[PDB]
Amino acid sequence: MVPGACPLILRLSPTLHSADLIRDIDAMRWFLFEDTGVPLPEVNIEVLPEPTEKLTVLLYQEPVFSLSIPAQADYLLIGADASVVGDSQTLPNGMGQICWLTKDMAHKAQGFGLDVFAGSQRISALLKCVLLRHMGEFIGVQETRYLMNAMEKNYSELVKELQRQLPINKIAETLQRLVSERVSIRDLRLIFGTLIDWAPREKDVLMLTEYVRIALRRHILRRLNPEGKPLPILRIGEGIENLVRESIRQTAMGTYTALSSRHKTQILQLIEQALKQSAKLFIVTSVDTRRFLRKITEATLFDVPILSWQELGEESLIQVVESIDLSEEELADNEE
């Protein structure tokens, strides 16, 4: 009877099991650590006797993924596009779309310039997708302590100064709030430097996270679009900025937002209305209204990146696509 759930378990029917699965999963874990900076725990391979070809992914013994992989498809392609269509289905929890492709069509799709997985890879490129959705769950107080112990080797004084500044729960909260936005915490030297700079002058951990995000703006704007080409930007007009800026209520532990449910519902409804025009859009708002806006759109629109103006330096051109704007709702619509 060992307290504490088993972190990451992958249950497979013995048909799906293989001999190179261990090294493929390890390579995927190393790629995920190099990309997002969170050191994932070992994946425990377990055998699930089932006549149907089915796999499950269990996080802390609560099953978060359950998919039954049809026998007809032997080639896997994550996501959908116009060039490739056929035998596609929706992943649960809004993880996206997957396509099972026949051999020749999959070879054509790979020639088209995309990634296509075959064999044990079809498991990794599935499992990895799940791990990219519940990522913020693998960074707590204990994982933060492990990261700080790892950094104590070459950076002893940096870690000692940081501990002298902030208690470990606040550092873990900052790292978790950074991970849950697809911001890599791979560069821990810069993160600890920014926390050391702004720890005496700030106590709201949300604002410390904002400062760390600003200090990491080059990385964010590199990861969002690897090429230098301009990608679409959806501005937020002054109406919404003033609406969310006026409702800021502060207590001894920091500032939060206090809006009517009607305001949030209308803002999300119109943002989803403005998001169906193009596949990818970066919502851009002011610095003082960015985080609050995020925490009214994180529950539903988790995979849309909410950037800020200061995070886009003068060296990035905008190319506005749409300009969302509103007036209030409870007092008078005036826009809606």
Give CA–CA dist 187/258, Å, rounded: 34
**Nearer CB in complex with a second copy: 57/101:** 57
Single residue of 71, 72, 157, 227 touching a second copy by CB under 8 A: 157
What DSSP letter does each residue of 133-150 carry, written as one string? Answer: TSGGGG-SHHHHHHHHHH
- Extract the tokens encoding 231: 């990608």
Contact (CB, 8 A) for 305 and 275 = no
Q: Is 158 in the site for a second copy (CB under 8 A)?
A: yes
Considering only 14, 70, 79, 86, the residue that binds a second copy (CB under 8 A) is 14
Interaction between residue 190 and a second copy (CB under 8 A)? yes
The single residue among 279, 314, 317, 332 that binds a second copy, judged by CB under 8 A, is 314
Question: What's phi and psi for 65, nearest 5 deg?
Answer: -135, 135
Interface with a second copy includes 102 (CB under 8 A)? no
**Chain mean position to CA 116:** 23
Strand residues in 161-247 grouped as ranges (E): 233-236
- Per DSSP, the residues of 23-41 read HHHHHHHHHHHHHH---PP
Backbone φ and ψ of 199, nearest 5°: -65, -45
List binders of a second copy among 191-220 (CB under 8 A). Answer: 192-193, 196-197, 200-201, 218-219
Q: Which is nearer to a second copy, 101 or 296 (CB)?
A: 296
Residues 247-276 that bind a second copy (CB under 8 A): 253
Please, are residues 183 and 306 in contact by the beta-carbon 8 Å criterion? no
33, 211, 256, 309: residue in contact with a second copy (rule CB under 8 A):
33
**Binding of a second copy by 173 (CB under 8 A):** yes
Q: How far is the CB of 17 from a second copy (least distance, A)?
A: 5
Compute φ and ψ for 321, nearest 5 degrees. -105, -45
Quote helix, strand, coil % in the chain, to nearest 5: 40, 20, 40
Q: Measured between alpha carbons, how far is 290 from 65 in angstroms, rounded to an integer? A: 32
How many chain residues bind a second copy (CB under 8 A)? 60
Task: Considering only the stretches 14-22, 73-81, 237-245, 279-287, report the one whose residues sit in contact with a second copy under the rule CB under 8 A.
Answer: 14-22
Query: In the bound complex, what is the minimum distance in angstroms from residue 225's beta carbon to a second copy?
Result: 14
Q: Please, what is the minimum distance in Å from the beta carbon of residue 171 to a second copy? A: 11
Choose, by CB under 8 A, the member of 80, 132, 168, 301 that binds a second copy.
168
* Only segment of 71-79, 155-163, 275-283, 285-293 that touches a second copy (CB under 8 A): 155-163
Going by DSSP bridges, is the β-strand pair 233-236/117-118 parallel, antiparallel, or unpaired?
Answer: unpaired
CA distance 179 to 116: 27
Site stretch for a second copy (CB under 8 A), options 31-39, 82-90, 106-114, 279-287:
31-39
Is 8 in contact with 41 (CB distance < 8 Å)? yes
Contacts to a second copy by CB under 8 A: 1-5, 13-15, 17-19, 30, 33-34, 37, 39, 47, 49, 60-63, 93, 140-142, 145, 147, 150-151, 154-158, 161, 165, 168-169, 173, 186-190, 192-193, 196-197, 200-201, 218-219, 222, 253, 299-300, 313-315
